[PDB]
Amino acid sequence: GLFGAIAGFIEGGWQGMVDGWYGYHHSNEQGSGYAADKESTQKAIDGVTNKVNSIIDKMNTQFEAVGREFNNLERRIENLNKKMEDGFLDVWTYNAELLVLMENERTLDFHDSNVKNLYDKVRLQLRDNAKELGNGCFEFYHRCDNECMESVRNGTYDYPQYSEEARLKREEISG
Amino acid sequence: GLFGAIAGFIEGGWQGMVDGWYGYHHSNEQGSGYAADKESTQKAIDGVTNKVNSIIDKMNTQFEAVGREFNNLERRIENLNKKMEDGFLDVWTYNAELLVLMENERTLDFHDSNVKNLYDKVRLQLRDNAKELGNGCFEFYHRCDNECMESVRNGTYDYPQYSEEARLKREEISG
Amino acid sequence: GLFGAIAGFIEGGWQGMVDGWYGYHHSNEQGSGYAADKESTQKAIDGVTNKVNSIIDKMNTQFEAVGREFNNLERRIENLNKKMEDGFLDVWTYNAELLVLMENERTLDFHDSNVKNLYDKVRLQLRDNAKELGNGCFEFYHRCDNECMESVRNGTYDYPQYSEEARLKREEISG
Amino acid sequence: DPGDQICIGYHANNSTEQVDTIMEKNVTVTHAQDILEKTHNGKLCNLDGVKPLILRDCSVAGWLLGNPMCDEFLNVPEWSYIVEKINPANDLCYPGNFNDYEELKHLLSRINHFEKIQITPKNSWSDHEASGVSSACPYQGRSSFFRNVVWLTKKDNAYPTIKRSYNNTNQEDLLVLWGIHHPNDATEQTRLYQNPTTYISVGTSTLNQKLVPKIATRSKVKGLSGRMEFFWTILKSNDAINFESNGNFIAPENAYKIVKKGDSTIMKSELEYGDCNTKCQTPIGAINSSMPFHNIHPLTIGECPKYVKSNRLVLATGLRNSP
Amino acid sequence: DPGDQICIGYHANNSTEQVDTIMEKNVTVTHAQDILEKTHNGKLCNLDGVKPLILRDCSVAGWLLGNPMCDEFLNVPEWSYIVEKINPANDLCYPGNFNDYEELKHLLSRINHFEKIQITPKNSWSDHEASGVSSACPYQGRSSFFRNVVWLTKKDNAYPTIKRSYNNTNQEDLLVLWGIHHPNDATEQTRLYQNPTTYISVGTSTLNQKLVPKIATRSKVKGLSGRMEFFWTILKSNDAINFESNGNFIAPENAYKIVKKGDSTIMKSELEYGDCNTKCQTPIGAINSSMPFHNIHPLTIGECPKYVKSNRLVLATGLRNSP
Amino acid sequence: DPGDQICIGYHANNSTEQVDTIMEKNVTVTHAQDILEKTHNGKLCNLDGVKPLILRDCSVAGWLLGNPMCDEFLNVPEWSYIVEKINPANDLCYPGNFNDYEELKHLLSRINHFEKIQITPKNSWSDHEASGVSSACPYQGRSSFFRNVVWLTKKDNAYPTIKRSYNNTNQEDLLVLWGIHHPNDATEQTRLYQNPTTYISVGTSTLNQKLVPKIATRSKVKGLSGRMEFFWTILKSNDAINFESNGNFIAPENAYKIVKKGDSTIMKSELEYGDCNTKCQTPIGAINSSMPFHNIHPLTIGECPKYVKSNRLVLATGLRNSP
Numbered sequence A, B, C: 001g002l003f004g005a006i007a008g009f010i011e012g013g014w015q016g017m018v019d020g021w022y023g024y025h026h027s028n029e030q031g032s033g034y035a036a037d038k039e040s041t042q043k044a045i046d047g048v049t050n051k052v053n054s055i056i057d058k059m060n061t062q063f064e065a066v067g068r069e070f071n072n073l074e075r076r077i078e079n080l081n082k083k084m085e086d087g088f089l090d091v092w093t094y095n096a097e098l099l100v101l102m103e104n105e106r107t108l109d110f111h112d113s114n115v116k117n118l119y120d121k122v123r124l125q126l127r128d129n130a131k132e133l134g135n136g137c138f139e140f141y142h143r144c145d146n147e148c149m150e151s152v153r154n155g156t157y158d159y160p161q162y163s164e165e166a167r168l169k170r171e172e173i174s175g
Numbered sequence D, E, F: 001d002p003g004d005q006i007c008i009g010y011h012a013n014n015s016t017e018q019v020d021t022i023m024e025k026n027v028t029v030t031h032a033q034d035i036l037e038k039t040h041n042g043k044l045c046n047l048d049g050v051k052p053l054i055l056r057d058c059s060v061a062g063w064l065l066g067n068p069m070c071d072e073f074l075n076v077p078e079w080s081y082i083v084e085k086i087n088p089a090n091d092l093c094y095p096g097n098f099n100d101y102e103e104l105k106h107l108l109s110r111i112n113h114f115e116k117i118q119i120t121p122k123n124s125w126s127d128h129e130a131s132g133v134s135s136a137c138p139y140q141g142r143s144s145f146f147r148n149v150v151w152l153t154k155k156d157n158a159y160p161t162i163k164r165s166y167n168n169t170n171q172e173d174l175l176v177l178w179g180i181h182h183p184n185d186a187t188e189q190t191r192l193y194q195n196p197t198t199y200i201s202v203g204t205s206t207l208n209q210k211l212v213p214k215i216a217t218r219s220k221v222k223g224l225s226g227r228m229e230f231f232w233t234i235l236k237s238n239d240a241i242n243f244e245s246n247g248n249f250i251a252p253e254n255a256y257k258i259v260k261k262g263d264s265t266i267m268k269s270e271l272e273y274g275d276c277n278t279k280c281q282t283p284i285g286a287i288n289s290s291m292p293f294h295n296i297h298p299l300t301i302g303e304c305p306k307y308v309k310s311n312r313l314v315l316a317t318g319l320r321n322s323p
Ligand SMILES: *[C@@H]1O[C@H](CO[C@@H]2O[C@@H](C)[C@@H](O)[C@@H](O)[C@@H]2O)[C@@H](O[C@@H]2O[C@H](CO)[C@@H](O)[C@H](O)[C@H]2NC(C)=O)[C@H](O[C@H]2O[C@@H](C)[C@@H](O)[C@@H](O)[C@@H]2O)[C@H]1NC(C)=O
Pocket: D219, D220, D221, D222, D223, F167, F168, F169, F238, F239, F240
């Protein structure tokens, strides 16, 4: 994609995440598990639905063909009528197909932007209290249970609360 | 947004900033204050203005309906004429609304991209001479009058010129 | 650009790089030189070439004008015929010009994206074994020959394999 | 020791649905929405509750003029649309043509109900023979003629000038039909109408018409080389129509009150009634769908999706899917 | 202790202007530009310096033929466009029809100025009476007739054959008008024209016409059962027109030189002159704007915005605005 | 001392090609693909292997009726398309008109080859003179006439009634032409045709036509004030056409079998043949290109790019180019 998140710096999708589009996998002493970011997926399901409806609403006024008949000496206006009717069908066929191709592209990049934007939402919370592995994961420089994890999933993660604890762990590695 | 800048990792705009679209807020002993980045706002006013002119100009030659009259045994051609003229008004109405809906979307994503590119313009200058707070602000690691701020606003900021004061301060936090 | 790579945090293009669109310039004891990114230039050639073809075929069915003649007392259907054909012609000209204008925009920003994602492909490999100069360049914290240079080009760069060689060098600077 | 870690990722599943994009085709995605209806039931149904007028092998002329082989339609109820075949078998039984036929058919597409009324009783022609018939218009093994017009001929050996007027005293506008006979030679002319040179005048507040027979030799169509030429007018409520004639007159017998105007169409289909119901009908089958597009036929009537020529039209709602 | 700090941010204000986008409606933005003109003055104006030809209750046919109730328009100056009502009251005072009226009207929409000339002095009919008059054509409470054609009838008890010719010696093309009278019975025919069997021949380098009256019974329109049928031609410069008739002839008295062609149209409007001026006119009011779009009426004349059916069209220039 | 470095960057070159975008015009780019063909060879060529029919100063009417100046086209080979000038000099040599001409010209756009057949040998007029000739149709300094129709006049002092019939026994449809002559006065009528009151009846399974001369005064066109009006019909395979007349008949001599149907058009061009070959032809030159668009002319025939009004149409393939 255009942002490097989906099928980029974070490879592959999570079969086991069935609750949403974007989210978190955690691994501490209380085992593993998946959890969806409700805020970033509700914004995304509402964004895509509005677009889909916005595509349908733009085609409410569109050309409708009607049958007209002509005698054997009205071949010129019969031809004028056929070209005119095929002409608009081609125009609206082009307009729909192009609208589908164009928004499909921007929907996929919407999902790409949303995942990378979620990554940087967590990356700016941990700072140096965790290390960027470069595959979408952060290895903490301290202990993080299942309410600390919850604090970063809802963005309440208070930094200095683990600042000193982590610093000591960094000094052990740089020795 | 698609970039996470406007209403993203930095929410809300600066009401007190009246000189441009994007810029800086600074706070040292020499009081506080705003300063607009005119360079990044000038590229953007030129960018948006050109777009507006390019959409209006692409529709200068467009379908115009003319009154034609038909008698009572010409209802077929009268109907052909009516369907054709409505037909083109609907095509050009669709073309105008859709062009607005699409470029409005891309006008907004143009702006956070300009904010994000500008954020990364100073972030890539200070590096470890500053700490990223993660909300659009940097509390840098040294002393800056109102000409130090000037060097980063125009991108002439020499790194080692203040690396040591910061280095000691990094060592001071490392104490 | 919309992503800040081309004509942004990395100024200018490389006249001396002739093998591809995006790539690397290296400087070790074994001299300097340019080298193309093989994987990323084909994905981009596949991307632009396919788009070019999808634009040509989305206009394969389009309005074709035909000659029609009318006598002196058919001015109304003569005029209707003229408006109908001029009308479809104006519609298809707009569709062609606007499709080109809109995809030109998206082609240049695609390039901007491909360069930035390539930047992040090596930045997340080297981490602290290198210093981001902030101009698109990385100065290593160790010695890097011409099998080290290729190793970062294939995403085979082993981080812990020489982290210590690098860690001591930072502390050598950190003294 | 490697410690606690939190990772960011996205949904993936076993979906196989593909989607097209400008730069890449057949991109597999987690969730997609089809917006193109591609299926129909292959039958002609009622539109909302209203049944179409299904002409069998009868054409609009056969119905309106009263081809004896179309008596099924002597008095049709309100219809939702008209169905006619491409080459109807029971059209003009006597050879000839219908004047401004296509403008008539177009008027019909704005009409949902006719009511037939008799405006000249066959027993009101006391100085003419009102019994013209032809072997080209058989009814029940015998020669007949159109039912809604009457073929007048000479009685004894005379054809007095007919001066007849009819006043549309109804509230509704009237569709009135009539004709003129073009014989093959002066002998046949004198046998049927006596008078060698004849005319027909038709007068209305707007119509000011004069017809004259074209007595001439022409090809046999269905064994006849004579021709019948028919005409029509809409007699407005309270206006009167005037006929003056000394031969070759195919006089109006029945006329049509326009009872209800509205949306209708004349569909060309070979299909037959289906005893089903729909809100969207095409000549090749009806549509029941909530998708906004379809590609089955451009000619539809009712509440319908928008026609497009596409074979496939799929929207991406979800994200790109991993192998 | 907290040291020196720098923050990077963007503008916000008290703006309430909303903008639509594909994925989101009603996005408040700092700066927006409206590009859709939605207002007009509700008047009929001059187009540049030029006044329209405003027919009041007169139709185009009423004007050109010279309906006595249209004497306001005997010699009109150059116009910018023509305004006509939906159902003008003063049309053909005498009942009948205007042949090829719509093709005449379309020619008229390509013309900016006529100059009326006399092509036959009314005192040149020395063997016919040229004072024909009708109660369906009142002028001052009395019977009159069209001013641009003359109703010829018999003088003494004869209608000598008219053989009259006119050569367009002018440099401009001539619009020439004439008619034929259709009486209701043979007695009126002889009362007006003496000759029972009459014709009208008209000849040009291209016109080759022969009319024959239709004497017949028909409905009363405005107390009359007669009809007048009018015809028109464009006589090219240096060409001649030739008339022959032995009765029922409504002869040309005045004709129109086509002095200037250009863009105009015939607008249908109930409005009256407005004593204003514009660069852009619609049937329901004039437009003074620099907007690139408008939604007031699809039929405009002059330098105008582009018509669209949109109720609203707002462009986003600024940024998303914070609550 | 400073160590090893790796840099990520992009291509640049000395290219100058500019490209347009929504926000900025003339952005210089490294690689572009032009897709707009703007050139033609400026001549009339063959389409595939097949030569066009280039009428020189002849019109389609002049060709089919057989204007003596169009003997070059008496038997033309199969054509790919037809080239005719805007105002061809050799048209209807005798003044008059061609009935439903534009509908005939339209029929012509699906015909690639005629094969002319004789339907009445000129030596079958034993009771009429078949030698009508006119100074309006000169051939080699002398009065001649159309070669495909025959001007019959009285013989001795009689014009017996003509009854001639033809049954199209061919597999292909037939184009049949005939005409009527309108004299200037009753004296000329009896001088040429003896009978003062004349007719022409033409009959087909579908045609039922009756013409009568319009004897009247008209302006001289090419020194003559008489007129000839021509008519045409398509006689289907196995149908018959019937002609009856007692004067003023311009009789069919030759008719056309429609032997090959296919795609064609009538192009209006002043150009002449070019001895080249093309796959795509326009009225002002041929197109040899691989471009998907072109801008030379809207009327093309064959395998062509799509017409657009654009002056420039360039795609960006490479990236923005550095100063
Ligand atoms: C046009 O001519 C056809 C062919 O003529 C017949 O065959 C010839 C080889 C020769 O023997 C002629 O003298 C023959 O009549 C003719 O069609 C034929 O008509 C006969 C009736 O006598 C039929 O029995 C025969 O089947 C038929 N042949 C074919 C191949 O159709 C047409 O005459 C009649 O044709 C029939 C089909 C009807 O259309 C009828 O109205 C018509 O009289 C003849 N066309 C016309 C308009 O006269």
